[PDB]
């Protein structure tokens, strides 16, 4: 029970990856997803209390902890193709706000725009910083974890054709990582084993599953509403299979409709004027090469009226069953009063 | 420009309440609402860092607002009574007695219950975190766990066994702060014991109430909406009599923005309703109270000046359809956003 799954982007718990990349990344202390995004060596921006523990596995499900771990080229492209109306093959390139500074990258995109390549610049907390929609007297401010921007020009001045937003869902873990991260620290410095791996696992409590959908729903329901409209191309939510299972509860376990393509959809999409997406990805796919690529397991097109109806109409309908938790709640009360009886 | 508004249930910023109860409660170090709820004297359960600071005042552009921070402050007999009448469908005059869960250990209290019940007095028992502990509805195949800040239980019997007819749910919204209040608490702490004489208002009070950060306005409605929508859907059904949310005027003003500034219907009585609730199946309520009404009562009574019967379908529509429509305005924040992206890119543009 309870173990660190990845250490600096490389597996450790079920399979212990020790490749030419995994050797150096661990020692130098580098989260590769940021380094690949930029063009320069950068560390996992977490505190030394919970350093390279970018992914964690408990009783057997993996969980996403470092939001920077979501920066997977294979996932980015996959998600962006559905947010902006792209086909499977259309040429696609991603930048990152800070890397607009060097001439080499700019020459590349100029050459790319000329031949019709979809150039997308992304903005993220530790990269180019993240961006927010303005407050209004009738609507609130919202921040995006990822802001994807269809670049169309960078020489007269920066100009963007359209924009998408992606939201990355991370998990909390009650206690601290300091014993687990502390134990594997001395092991890594100078000098797989059942005795050694047991120490790196035994230290931390389980997931903080209390808020997995409670904190997310509103901004999701809200940001999904803005998706198909007003130079906003689409809104997506990125979640691991672990979190999707939890989500199915709050959504009264529906049945996804499997479209012609490798696509599923909540409710009827046939004529949907929004562009809302939920991407369920696998943390450990069939392959085991380099850092594990975040493959899209499920690509779900959301119907906002079904998401609201399921979450807030159909779900509490199941809670109001004639044998359900609201009918039997009075019993919990009565039993608790008994505790006080002399 | 941020001050401690209430110290141990007594005002400390706008006007200095120096009544007899104000002098005792603070010096003894007691949160008086827990003391009243129990039948034992009890201190504010908050840590030595953010001690008896139960309410906080901030500037917020202009006008200046009061925020609730100690959830134990909402334990106001007058409020709880006013609120519960609406949840259960009690008339304004019917006798009503409230009894905290831990006080069921006493027999003299239990003998009181038996007496009231035989007279036809409505006996409600409540379950709050520090008091009787919180209560939760259990998660199923198709629904999640929820715990209620206040579980209001309509007692039906007590002698043979505990029996309840139906239950109410009251939820209290508290405001979070950025930094610790320890610098402010510490300064007022030294002043309280090491120096007699209330009088400290200009140099003394302002400094003691300084070193304080503003409110975390980020989670004001977003963190509460689902919780609310879901619990509201349950309100008029299956032995759940009703469910209410208690929020200060300050938070309410903010809640209107998230709801696209809707106009409230005016019922015959002193209630308001959000949307048409004439044939409403649920029993959903929002209770807005003033923290500082024009009164000089030692601890300020939380008098709900607004009691709003909610239409669940209306609540959702406004929060999840109308508000995003505002955001998608002709020149709104969604249209304008593309400019923020472009302006940002310039901050990474090559120079020299
Ligand atoms: Fe990382
Ligand atoms: Fe208090």
UniProtKB/TrEMBL annotation, chain B:
Transmembrane residue ranges: none
Alphabetic keyword roster: Calcium, Endonuclease, Hydrolase, Metal-binding, Nuclease
Annotated positions binding Fe(3+): 31, 44, 54, 70
GO MF: endonuclease activity; identical protein binding; metal ion binding
Binding site for Ca(2+): 134, 149
Official protein name in the record: NotI restriction endonuclease
């Amino acid at each position: 029970a309870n173990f660190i799954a990845e250490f600096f982007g490389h597996r450790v718990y079920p399979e212990v990856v020790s490749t030419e990349a995994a050797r150096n990344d661990q020692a130098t202390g580098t989260c590769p997803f940021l380094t690949a995004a930029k063009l320069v060596e950068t560390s996992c921006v977490k505190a030394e209390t919970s350093r390279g523990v970018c992914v964690v596995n408990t009783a057997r499900y993996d969980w996403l902890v470092c939001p920077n771990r979501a920066l997977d080229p294979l996932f980015m492209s996959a998600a962006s193709r559905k947010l902006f109306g792209y086909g499977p093959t259309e040429p696609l390139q991603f930048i990152a706000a800070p890397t607009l500074a060097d001439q080499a990258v700019r020459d590349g995109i100029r050459e790319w725009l000329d031949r019709g390549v979809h150039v997308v610049a992304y903005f993220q907390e530790k990269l180019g910083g993240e961006l927010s929609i303005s407050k209004t007297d009738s609507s609130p401010e919202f921040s995006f974890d990822w802001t994807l921007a269809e670049v169309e020009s960078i020489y007269p001045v920066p100009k963007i054709k359209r924009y998408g937003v992606l939201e990355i869902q991370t998990m909390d873990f009650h206690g601290s990582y300091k014993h687990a991260v502390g134990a594997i620290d001395i092991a890594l410095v100078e000098g797989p084993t059942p005795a050694g791996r047991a120490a790196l696992s035994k230290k931390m409590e389980g997931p903080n599953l209390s808020n997995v959908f409670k904190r997310t729903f509103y901004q999701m329901a809200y940001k999904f509403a803005l998706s198909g409209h007003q130079r906003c191309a689409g809104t997506g939510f990125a979640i691991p299979q672990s979190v999707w299972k939890s989500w199915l509860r709050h959504l009264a376990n529906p049945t996804l409709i499997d479209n012609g393509d490798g696509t599923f959809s909540l409710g009827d999409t046939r004529n949907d004027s929004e562009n809302a997406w939920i991407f369920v990805f696998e943390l450990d796919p069939d392959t085991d090469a380099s850092p594990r690529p975040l493959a899209p397991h499920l690509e779900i097109r959301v119907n906002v009226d079904t998401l609201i109806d399921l979450a807030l109409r159909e779900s509490p309908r199941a809670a109001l069953g004639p044998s359900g938790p609201v009918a039997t709640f009075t019993d919990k009360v009565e039993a608790r009063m008994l505790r006080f009886w002399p």
